[PDB]
Scaffold this active site. Structure first.
Site, PDB file in Angstrom:
ATOM      1  N   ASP A  42      -5.669  -9.968   2.323  1.00 12.96           N
ATOM      2  CA  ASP A  42      -6.792  -9.045   2.290  1.00 12.96           C
ATOM      3  C   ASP A  42      -7.881  -9.639   1.420  1.00 12.96           C
ATOM      4  O   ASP A  42      -7.606 -10.449   0.532  1.00 12.96           O
ATOM      5  CB  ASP A  42      -6.341  -7.708   1.744  1.00 12.96           C
ATOM      6  CG  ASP A  42      -5.226  -7.100   2.570  1.00 12.96           C
ATOM      7  OD1 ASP A  42      -5.462  -6.827   3.762  1.00 12.96           O
ATOM      8  OD2 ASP A  42      -4.110  -6.899   2.038  1.00 12.96           O
TER       9      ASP A  42
ATOM     10  N   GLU B  87     -17.996   3.168  -5.751  1.00  9.78           N
ATOM     11  CA  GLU B  87     -18.710   4.339  -6.239  1.00  9.78           C
ATOM     12  C   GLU B  87     -19.155   4.182  -7.688  1.00  9.78           C
ATOM     13  O   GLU B  87     -20.274   4.534  -8.036  1.00  9.78           O
ATOM     14  CB  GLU B  87     -17.859   5.594  -6.069  1.00  9.78           C
ATOM     15  CG  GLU B  87     -17.300   5.781  -4.671  1.00  9.78           C
ATOM     16  CD  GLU B  87     -16.872   7.210  -4.392  1.00  9.78           C
ATOM     17  OE1 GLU B  87     -16.246   7.839  -5.276  1.00  9.78           O
ATOM     18  OE2 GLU B  87     -17.158   7.705  -3.277  1.00  9.78           O
TER      19      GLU B  87
ATOM     20  N   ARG C 154     -22.289  -6.516   0.649  1.00 10.23           N
ATOM     21  CA  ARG C 154     -21.795  -5.382   1.403  1.00 10.23           C
ATOM     22  C   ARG C 154     -22.734  -4.264   1.003  1.00 10.23           C
ATOM     23  O   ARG C 154     -22.697  -3.819  -0.140  1.00 10.23           O
ATOM     24  CB  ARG C 154     -20.360  -5.068   0.972  1.00 10.23           C
ATOM     25  CG  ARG C 154     -19.623  -4.021   1.788  1.00 10.23           C
ATOM     26  CD  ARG C 154     -18.211  -3.845   1.232  1.00 10.23           C
ATOM     27  NE  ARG C 154     -17.789  -2.442   1.213  1.00 10.23           N
ATOM     28  CZ  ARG C 154     -18.148  -1.539   0.291  1.00 10.23           C
ATOM     29  NH1 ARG C 154     -18.951  -1.868  -0.718  1.00 10.23           N
ATOM     30  NH2 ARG C 154     -17.707  -0.291   0.379  1.00 10.23           N
TER      31      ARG C 154
ATOM     32  N   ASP D 269      -0.757  -3.486  -0.027  1.00 12.75           N
ATOM     33  CA  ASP D 269      -0.767  -2.693  -1.264  1.00 12.75           C
ATOM     34  C   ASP D 269      -0.662  -1.176  -1.094  1.00 12.75           C
ATOM     35  O   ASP D 269      -0.268  -0.480  -2.028  1.00 12.75           O
ATOM     36  CB  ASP D 269      -1.978  -3.059  -2.141  1.00 12.75           C
ATOM     37  CG  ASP D 269      -3.255  -2.307  -1.747  1.00 12.75           C
ATOM     38  OD1 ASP D 269      -3.664  -2.363  -0.563  1.00 12.75           O
ATOM     39  OD2 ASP D 269      -3.863  -1.666  -2.639  1.00 12.75           O
TER      40      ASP D 269
ATOM     41  N   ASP E 148       0.924   0.063   4.453  1.00 16.44           N
ATOM     42  CA  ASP E 148       1.153  -1.377   4.520  1.00 16.44           C
ATOM     43  C   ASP E 148       2.623  -1.721   4.656  1.00 16.44           C
ATOM     44  O   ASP E 148       2.957  -2.772   5.185  1.00 16.44           O
ATOM     45  CB  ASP E 148       0.609  -2.080   3.282  1.00 16.44           C
ATOM     46  CG  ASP E 148      -0.886  -2.286   3.334  1.00 16.44           C
ATOM     47  OD1 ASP E 148      -1.417  -2.510   4.443  1.00 16.44           O
ATOM     48  OD2 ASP E 148      -1.528  -2.240   2.261  1.00 16.44           O
TER      49      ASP E 148
ATOM     50  N   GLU F  41      26.073 -44.374 -13.295  1.00 13.60           N
ATOM     51  CA  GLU F  41      25.738 -42.956 -13.124  1.00 13.60           C
ATOM     52  C   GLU F  41      24.426 -42.620 -13.817  1.00 13.60           C
ATOM     53  O   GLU F  41      23.594 -41.926 -13.236  1.00 13.60           O
ATOM     54  CB  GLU F  41      26.859 -42.030 -13.608  1.00 13.60           C
ATOM     55  CG  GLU F  41      28.180 -42.179 -12.855  1.00 13.60           C
ATOM     56  CD  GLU F  41      28.226 -41.476 -11.502  1.00 13.60           C
ATOM     57  OE1 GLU F  41      27.252 -41.587 -10.717  1.00 13.60           O
ATOM     58  OE2 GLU F  41      29.265 -40.830 -11.214  1.00 13.60           O
TER      59      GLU F  41
HETATM   60 MG   LIG Z   1      -7.761  -3.007   0.485  1.00 17.05          MG
END
Ligand SMILES: [Mg+2]
Ligand SMILES: [Mg+2]
Ligand SMILES: [Mg+2]
Ligand SMILES: [Mg+2]
Ligand code: NA
Ligand code: NA
Lengths: 994, 31, 994
Positions: free
Chosen positions: C351, C442, C560, C703, C707, C908
């Site tokens: 993600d 937010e 975004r 998460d 999921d 060895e």
């Molecule tokens: Mg997420």
């Protein structure tokens, strides 16, 4: 070499390449040693541990039992394949118990063979060879003789290897070939070659075969063959079993043990028979097959455990241990069966010189003539100091030292001693002491002259070695010893002819010197030398001399004294024939007395008490001496053979006096005779003979060749450790130290050993009786088997394993030497003894089944509690209107079995303590006297607790560990065995004394 | 000399050993 | 409490005495804490050091060997008990050695345990409790929970203890009790009492069982039982062995060791078997039985050191130390098998937000309408400074700071942001930094309003706490948020309904505030607010807006951004139904566009490189993001998932687009797709499934609750450390830091651990093949045994003791992350690898028997020197016409033995240095890279020298200290192993690259 008899003496010296003077060389020695090997027989292989265990498992009974245990295990699958574990494990238990019970046996026999063998270690075969190292004779081990070296043999010697005769040193040689040729009679030899090389032994009269004896003479020789090449070695690869005789003790023991073997077997078949009515029972698969097998195993097992096994072995083990002990004390046991006899010894004829005495010869006193006047006769007495062969001492007159040289009488005296001598002195350096070279008598004489020094010669500025024969040399410097008219018993004397050294034309200057017994020498005297003068021998003079001789021979020193004399007008050097002894006394006449030496050899310190010990033991001692009758009796008084004051006229004889008795009276004489003086070699034999005709068991000493007959004749032949090889081979025992005391010790050992054998027997027999009354008492009263096969064979492995063998270390019993000698007639196991065996045996058996019955009948704090009818334990499953809250399966409780086992084992350790003394209480003979046994008691109890507490074991053994209370019960039930035997002991001790 | 003590040790180990081989041998069929 | 399900809500509150508002009191806490105990299970004891040692002493082989080592000794004191010393000590050393062997064994299993249990330390179980201390919720250890206190649970939580449901906060409550109930489907819960107290778990629908998950909802409750009183607790006292599975790799290895075992058995009883015609040798006391034992000892003494025992354990060793490192790098391995898979990882679906990016949300830019005149359209673009959630920054226009309150558009813009918000800010004093209270998106919005301050309210004269929400409060003072029409993905937006403050009679005063994706929000606009005015929305206006949004979303910031709009004439307060989402979009229409906020969450710095590393490892990375298609691709380009210019038309799909494909096309899309935007929860599963259909090993991040399914499906499920406990229990690995980079690190470690696992194997297997051919070569060429059992087992105790364990500290290999992902299909030990094991193995064996051969055939400065026929050493005692000055007893010289040992050991150490890298040269991979191994080499040699130089030792070990020259021979014979492997390495490295 080969056919050395066919070859000439030189052809033999040549073949090896050696001169008869040089002897072999260290090289040739190592060469021959490697080319030929040691002179001996091949040290045989023997046997292996593996093999003997197998051979043990060859017993029918052993096989039988083991086979039946395999079949009954193979039938543990078919009817009801249930839980087995233990039923599989049983067979593997038995064969392991048996295995370990056989391994122990090997240890015993190994140990047995060992000690017996290990005696030869004490007395190894030697030889006289000439080699390169030194010029003189070397004494060596016979095994270290290489075929080729030069050998010397003499009277009484044993032939170390096969020899070709080189040179006969004596005038004739005689040989006892009896061992080989078979011929008893001694054969003469020569040094010439024997023609035919294809000839036989008896024909080889120039050869000496290893293992033969020199009967008479001396010879030189060269070794032809050794080892297996020997004419004897080629016969010892023939017979393996050269001994087939049974001592009358083993013979009676194999008789008794065979009687038990039979009875044990009968009441062993009986057990398997009185159980036929139980072959069918369900608890055995309900089959006559498993029925008749569960009891068959019990039968064969009891038999295997109770049959008195190696009873003869007990004697073998006991003789083994006694043997080693005797040897430790200087008593070398030649013949084994002899020890059994040794206990029963009732008479000892011992020689005086060297056995009863030290043979440490020394001149104490000596007298000469002082002054003579009609009836007046004075002596010049002297004492000499120092008792050792050492030329250190002094000559005292009236307790004041003097110069002997200042006495003409003593000069002649010392002259005669030096010239009438064939022996001489030798100072050893390694030891640092002077020592004899010849007879002790003559050597004491040599020493006398070295102290006297009649010529005041030097001494201190002489080495310790030159000192040795200084004054003697000087004396020889004056006179020339021409020849010697040696001693003969027929006249009791000897003489030498001597001519001066510094004399050209002397017609009257030669003298004869005489030395011998007073008695006769004095009688052949017409003159009594006085310093340098000479007078007629009056009656009184002869009287004075004799009384002093008598005095000294009877005194508290019991001196053996010689008279010394000279002939002043000796017959012509030619009128004398030096062949016939009968003419010597004729030459030794018309003499002049010179003097007398008194000499001493003291009695051994121990002899005194040793004699007393024989008195206590009820053993008669008979002294055999070469002294006159007078001194002889004296010595007997002096050492306690005779009382101080008691009468002895009929208890002491001379050879002569004996011979003057008729035969009936001679036999009569031996029943009480204690002293014999001046005897002939034959008298030993006759004395033994007579002694035997009274049923006496006789021990007879000896050491010479002419002793052999009487030694073989006697019950116990005793040869001196320093004596002839002929003597030893003919005797049954050798004195390492030639000590009379040793003989007495040896006898005490005989008694002691006999007692320890009785200890072992009582313990085995009795423990086995109990082992049988046990398994029979349960079968008879119908009781639940108190012990199973595995348990019994285990107990067997412990009892006959540790305590039993630890009895081998029992100290000697007490009254041992306060009893009369045992008769060789009385039986081994008496009636009383057999009662004793049964009582104890029967008791342990009853105590074992009663231990089991205690957990039922009178069961305290434990299950069962079936006070009654514990008997009929078979009608439990079926007929149970009698059971009251009791499970039938309880008859298989691992507690009664653990009771039985835990009592039988404890009672055996107790019984072991009972077997410390044959009669003496544990309060008079405490248990901690045999620590070995006490240690064995511990180990045994270790094993028992372990087989009970280590989880795998008690399971397979059908046992369960018991509580402290029940252990106390075990004790309360075992410990009364000690008391029982204690009672019996007290009865045997106070009511049946002997 | 006396191999006396060797005699009691050997007869203590022969009955020690054959008991050790009983613990052992019983378990080789147990498993 | 008891049967709390039967009791009512109050009857429970009462029974403990606590209000469902107060929570428990510190007193009541301590009290119950002692009256009941910590909330957990009783820490198991397990076993003791010694108690496990004994367990190891139970082997068939250890028995057999430790038996015939005492059987042989009993047959040594009692059969032919000669001088022994070493013969007794040998058995008493075999066991001593074996003791020190197990000590290493147990130590390793301990270490294996420690690492494992030490994983729960990383992820402790927590709980949400209400208590007296504070008024808000308190998060604590689940162990610190006392039955009685008030517990709060939410979506995705694990139930910490058995809880009685007090109050259901959400509208329904769903619970996943699968773990206990077995019922896969989630069950509903209620607050009512269940009648029958004797009822079952499945019926207790008012209860919450410790160990269960909240599938959906939120609730309050009171703890009833804890610890072992729990319904899960009483079941955890049931099964102890819950490891009833083994990775297909472990089996592939146990299968191989089993093959070797079988072969090591054959050519082991072939060693003893071919040695029968030597059972009867004289040095064996000539015993079939003694010979069998002796060679039988060699056979079993092989097995015990030759057969590879703890191979299945070596795998575990590795995982242990691997896991531990992984956890140290922030990758907690929930599932142990998973690590083996982790290597083969071929694909990672991660993600974007929070994992690829920081999720450090902040608004960089924003615009509003400046002027609109038909076809003219100007925007007012602004930038904001400060990326932290801190309300400290400035609003610039054209790089010049301005006062945002002076722009009307911005006023409304900020109003919408403050009122369309459910999150807020909080100033932490401890940390002294501002932090979010809700969703990052937010909160970043709250921060924007705080930075803007459209009302010029005071700021500086306020504490750092009041500042936090100052301007936000102000904006709320103006409007009254009646209700919110929350977000639904079907319309990509949300809104609130507000009424003004001071205003009663304003039916025309209420407004609706919309915030959401620009796309659909803009389309529901018919007006475009210009300051305080309104105009109609033209085609050109919409086009200007959209172009700027596109520019930002595609720019080098890949913002975004959201559109902010208002409804001026909102439908009547009653016309609206607030149940159905479907009607909301209908309400949010006829809007006025206000402005756009563009916001950032930057990609993690490391992500960039990590992606590159994945490209190199041949591992494909698939980004799943909620952004639109455009921005998504942009981001992908920006982080290197895609090339700056490359065509991606078929490698990026939106949820929608994917769903519009038919099933066959979808499967096709996954084989090359690398970017997924705006997808549903289900698409995670389908994607996984298709990837599986291409035989990919897929890693899948997750998460949330929804999921779980895909996480359970994926080969490696990866939950975020900050996510639902439901995701965590469903997954195989937890990201402590949620960092994509960490996943990549986890895969690297997976590859490395597989390598170290290879290292260990090689060394073990090889050294062992050596240990065998050594003892087979001497038995086939009939040589004098080069090694004896005590030597062999000693070497074994060292080799598998110090060097072997020190290899666990090997640094990661080199080409590690440059190859393609390993196939879970390819076998562990390949053909080439086997050949590699035999080569080195068979070589060291040859070099050991040769080391002895050199002391004989080529014997320099030493005895033997028997150039030939050293073979037939048995016919030396017997048939010795061939010996030339040579003592046969030399075949037991303490030198050839000291060679073999002194060689084997050194080789060895060498072979251990070969086992630093699987393929990399010691020049590419210096030996001083693993100091621990290097340290092990010193100690190993320290023991070897000491076992040859401290007198008690070399004696018991049949060894003699060798000379510096011969040591140079050892080297000249060992060191060509380095070269041999180095050759084979160069071959695989250059010829069989992969
Ligand atoms: Mg997420
Ligand atoms: Mg018996
Ligand atoms: Mg005499
Ligand atoms: Mg090994
Ligand atoms: Na006789
Ligand atoms: Na999964």
């Amino acid at each position: 070499m080969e056919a050395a008899h066919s070859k000439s003496t030189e052809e033999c010296l040549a073949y090896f390449g050696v001169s008869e003077t040089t002897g072999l060389t260290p090289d040739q020695v190592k060469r021959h040693l490697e080319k030929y090997g040691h002179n001996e027989l091949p040290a045989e292989e023997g046997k292996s541990l593996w093999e003997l265990v197998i051979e043990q498992f060859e017993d029918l009974l052993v096989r039988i039992l083991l086979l039946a245990a395999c079949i009954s295990f193979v039938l543990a699958w078919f009817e009801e394949g249930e839980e087995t574990i233990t039923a599989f494990v049983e067979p593997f238990v038995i064969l392991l118990i048996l295995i370990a019970n056989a391994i122990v046996g090997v240890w015993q026999e190994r140990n047995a063979e060992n000690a017996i063998e290990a005696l030869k270690e004490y007395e190894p075969e030697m030889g006289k060879v000439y080699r390169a190292d030194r010029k003189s004779v070397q004494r060596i081990k016979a095994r270290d003789i290489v075929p080729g070296d030069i050998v010397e043999v003499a009277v009484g010697d044993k032939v170390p290897a096969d020899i070709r005769i080189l040179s006969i040193k004596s005038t004739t040689l005689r040989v006892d070939q009896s061992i080989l040729t078979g011929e008893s009679v001694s054969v003469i030899k020569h040094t010439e070659p024997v023609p035919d090389p294809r000839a036989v032994n008896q024909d080889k009269k120039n050869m000496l075969f290893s293992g033969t004896n020199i009967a008479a003479g001396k010879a030189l020789g060269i070794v032809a063959t050794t080892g297996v090449s020997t004419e004897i070695g080629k016969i010892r690869d023939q017979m393996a079993a050269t001994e087939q005789d049974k001592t009358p003790l083993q013979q009676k023991l194999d008789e008794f043990g065979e009687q038990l073997s039979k009875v044990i077997s009968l009441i062993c078949v009986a057990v398997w028979l009185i159980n036929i009515g139980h072959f069918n029972d369900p608890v055995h698969g309900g089959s006559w097959i498993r029925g008749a097998i569960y009891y068959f195993k019990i039968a064969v097992a009891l038999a295997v455990a109770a049959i008195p096994e190696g009873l003869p072995a007990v004697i073998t083990t006991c003789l083994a241990l006694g043997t080693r002990r005797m040897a430790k004390k200087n008593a070398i046991v030649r013949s084994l069966p002899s020890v059994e006899t040794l206990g029963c010894t009732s008479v000892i004829c011992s020689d005086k010189t060297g056995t009863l005495t030290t043979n440490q010869m020394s001149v104490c006193k000596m007298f000469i003539i002082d002054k003579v006047d009609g009836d007046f006769c004075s002596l010049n007495e002297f004492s000499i100091t120092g008792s050792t062969y050492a030329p250190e001492g002094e000559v005292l007159k009236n307790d004041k030292p003097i110069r002997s040289g200042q006495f003409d009488g003593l000069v002649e005296l010392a002259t005669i001693c030096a010239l009438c001598n064939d022996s001489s002195l030798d100072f050893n350096e390694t030891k640092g002491v002077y020592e004899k070279v010849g007879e002790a008598t003559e050597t004491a004489l040599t020493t006398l002259v070295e102290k006297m020094n009649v010529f005041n010669t030097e001494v201190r500025n002489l080495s310790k070695v030159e000192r040795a024969n200084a004054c003697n040399s000087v004396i020889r410097q004056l006179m020339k010893k021409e020849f010697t008219l040696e001693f003969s018993r027929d006249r009791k004397s000897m003489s030498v002819y001597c001519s001066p050294a510094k004399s050209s034309r002397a017609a009257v200057g030669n003298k004869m010197f005489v030395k011998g017994a007073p008695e006769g020498v004095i009688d052949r005297c017409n003159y009594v030398r006085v310093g340098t003068t000479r007078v007629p021998m009056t009656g009184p003079v002869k009287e004075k001399i004799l009384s002093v001789i008598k005095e000294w021979g009877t005194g508290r020193d019991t001196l053996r004294c010689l008279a010394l004399a000279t002939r002043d007008t000796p017959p012509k050097r030619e009128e004398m024939v030096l062949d016939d002894s009968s003419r010597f006394m004729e030459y030794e006449t018309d003499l002049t007395f010179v003097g007398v030496v008194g000499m001493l050899d003291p009695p051994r310190k121990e002899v005194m008490g040793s004699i007393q010990l024989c008195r206590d033991a009820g053993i008669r001692v008979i002294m055999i001496t070469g002294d006159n009758k007078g001194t002889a009796i004296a010595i007997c008084r002096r050492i306690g053979i005779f009382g101080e004051n008691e009468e002895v006229a009929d208890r002491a004889y001379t050879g002569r006096e004996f011979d003057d008795l008729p035969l009936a009276e001679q036999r009569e004489a031996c029943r009480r005779a204690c002293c014999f003086a001046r005897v002939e070699p034959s008298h030993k034999s006759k004395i033994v003979e007579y002694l035997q005709s009274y049923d006496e068991i006789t021990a007879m000493t000896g050491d010479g060749v002419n002793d052999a007959p009487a030694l073989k004749k006697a019950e116990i032949g005793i040869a001196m450790g320093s004596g002839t090889a002929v003597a030893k081979t003919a005797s049954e025992m050798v004195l390492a130290d030639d000590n009379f005391s040793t003989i007495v010790a040896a006898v005490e050992e005989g008694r002691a050993i006999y007692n320890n054998m009785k200890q072992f027997i009582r313990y085995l027999i009795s423990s086995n009786v109990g082992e049988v009354v046990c398994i029979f008492l349960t079968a008879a009263l119908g009781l639940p088997e108190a012990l199973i096969p595995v348990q019994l064979l285990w107990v067997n492995l412990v009892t006959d394993g540790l305590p039993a063998t630890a009895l081998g270390f029992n100290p000697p019993d007490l009254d041992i030497m306060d009893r009369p000698p045992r008769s060789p007639k009385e039986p081994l196991i008496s009636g009383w003894l057999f009662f004793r065996y049964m009582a104890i045996g029967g008791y342990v058996g009853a105590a074992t089944v009663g231990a089991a019955a205690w957990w039922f009948m009178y069961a305290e704090d434990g299950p069962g509690v079936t006070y009654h009818q514990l008997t009929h334990f078979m009608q439990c499953t079926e007929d149970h209107p009698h059971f009251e809250g009791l499970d039938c399966e309880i008859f298989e409780a691992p507690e009664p079995m653990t009771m039985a086992l835990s009592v039988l084992v404890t009672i055996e350790m107790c019984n072991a303590l009972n077997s410390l003394s044959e009669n003496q209480s544990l309060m008079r003979m405490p248990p901690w006297v045999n620590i070995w046994l006490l240690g064995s008691i511990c180990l045994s109890m270790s094993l028992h607790f372990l087989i009970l507490y280590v989880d795998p074991l008690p399971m397979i053994f059908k046992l369960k560990a018991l509580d402290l209370t029940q252990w106390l019960m075990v004790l309360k039930i075992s410990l009364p065995v000690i008391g029982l035997d204690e009672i019996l002991k007290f009865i045997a001790r106070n009511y049946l004394e002997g | 000399m006396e191999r006396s003590t060797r005699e009691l040790c050997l007869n203590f180990t022969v009955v020690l050993i054959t008991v050790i081989l009983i613990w052992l041998l019983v378990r080789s069929y147990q498993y």
